[PDB]
Amino acid sequence: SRRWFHPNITGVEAENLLLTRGVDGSFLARPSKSNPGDFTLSVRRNGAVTHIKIQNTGDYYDLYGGEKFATLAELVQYYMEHHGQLKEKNGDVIELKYPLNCADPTSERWFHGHLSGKEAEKLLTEKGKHGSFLVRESQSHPGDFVLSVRTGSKVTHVMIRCQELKYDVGGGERFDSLTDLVEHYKKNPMVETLGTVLQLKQPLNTTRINAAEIESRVRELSKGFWEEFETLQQQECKLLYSRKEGQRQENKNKNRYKNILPFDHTRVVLHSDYINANIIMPKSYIATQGCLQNTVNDFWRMVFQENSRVIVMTTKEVERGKSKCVKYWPDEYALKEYGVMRVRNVKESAAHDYTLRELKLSKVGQGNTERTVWQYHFRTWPDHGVPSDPGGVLDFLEEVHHKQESIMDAGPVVVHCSAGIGRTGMFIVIDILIDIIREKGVDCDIDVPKTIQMVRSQRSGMVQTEAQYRFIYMAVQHYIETLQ
């Protein structure tokens, strides 16, 4: 529910809360202030609390003394089911049982704060349609709040009272949080004495902009990005789709990371049929993990079957001493057979930021089925964080786009890194956003969080860090600004 995630809590605070309001098996998750980017899973057992690090360095969440995951939500779901798997001192097992809910509404899409009554009516006027709503703090009766809704023709305002940390609309139920209050009236709408029904359909969109004003939006978010990224993160519980196929005993060894699996509904099916990969539709894409030694034949079968002619590799084979992907292509001028798949490395050309490999791909025994597959291999991604300038990624992407565009009836573009969710998500999203622009010019509407959220519903946790989030904005602004 993401209720168990507390965006504005301290470690000490976390300990008090679990100790007073919680019980054994209670837990919560919070950003770690012991060096940002991290997160902590705070859990109570034996009348005491332990804090457990989870790292995200761009590729995944790594629970210490636990598995690797695509989202915190998937992490929590996994340990709230599979009991005995979450171990403490490499021995003691901790049980996640009782999510300790957060009454802090800052990460809701519908929540603003700071905002005036009039600036509310303007945005609900400019941007809103039937059902759109927001909550803001009352300025006139401070400590209270106001819910404003459009019936798109009309803006209605409802006072929300805070009475010793409980919320009400002046009668009826007193709720533990504004989220509960909101969720209650989204399903149990209010009626005006007059007959109009206040449907709370969708929160007001405060992220879609005209592309011509990304310079503006960025500087605003630059003193911002975090609240917005976190608002998106809070939406990940809506995205817990089934991932049964990757979880079969037969398929387990085909996954590089056990718990980072493809959604059943968008997975690439091989005509065994399993590969850890998904179709991403916004030009379509396939997002996949870096090959294992034992999935290389599957990888090429996939490329063949889908008629993909471009492949984008966003990782070095080894980074920070860790293997990310196995070399799955021939030396230059060599030919190899991968099961029934044959690939020749016809030529390589290095540029500053990447290497290009021209590969010929075919089924063994059927030379009529040959086609040129172009592999772009991004080599300059840094150890930590993201690149300083987006010019590299950009020229890389524009070059990829043009190769794709110059081949008739080309299939999806295959994008991968290691888990296939971090840089992989970041590249696809950037590419989707620029596509819109090359088509519709500069006078058009783009929406970063919503675009990521659309992609997240097709493969788990696409775009992993706030650092990748910020980078997307920088990348698009750059492209915009150099279009003049």
Curated annotation (Swiss-Prot):
The active site is at C417. GO terms for biological process: atrioventricular canal development; axonogenesis; Bergmann glial cell differentiation; brain development; cellular response to epidermal growth factor stimulus; cellular response to mechanical stimulus; cerebellar cortex formation; cytokine-mediated signaling pathway. PROSITE patterns: SH2, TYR_PHOSPHATASE_1, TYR_PHOSPHATASE_2, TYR_PHOSPHATASE_PTP. Residues 225-475 form the Tyrosine-protein phosphatase domain. Changing R456W: In LPRD1; reduced phosphatase activity. Phosphorylated upon activation of the receptor-type kinase FLT3. Phosphorylated upon activation of the receptor-type kinase PDGFRA. Phosphorylated by activated PDGFRB. Residues 4-100, 110-204 form the SH2 domain. It is an enzyme of class 3 (hydrolase). Widely expressed, with highest levels in heart, brain, and skeletal muscle. Changing E74K: In JMML; increases protein tyrosine phosphatase activity against CDC73. Belongs to the protein-tyrosine phosphatase family. Non-receptor class 2 subfamily. It is linked to LEOPARD syndrome 1: A disorder characterized by lentigines, electrocardiographic conduction abnormalities, ocular hypertelorism, pulmonic stenosis, abnormalities of genitalia, retardation of growth, and sensorineural deafness. The SH2 domains repress phosphatase activity. Binding of these domains to phosphotyrosine-containing proteins relieves this auto-inhibition, possibly by inducing a conformational change in the enzyme. This is Tyrosine-protein phosphatase non-receptor type 11.
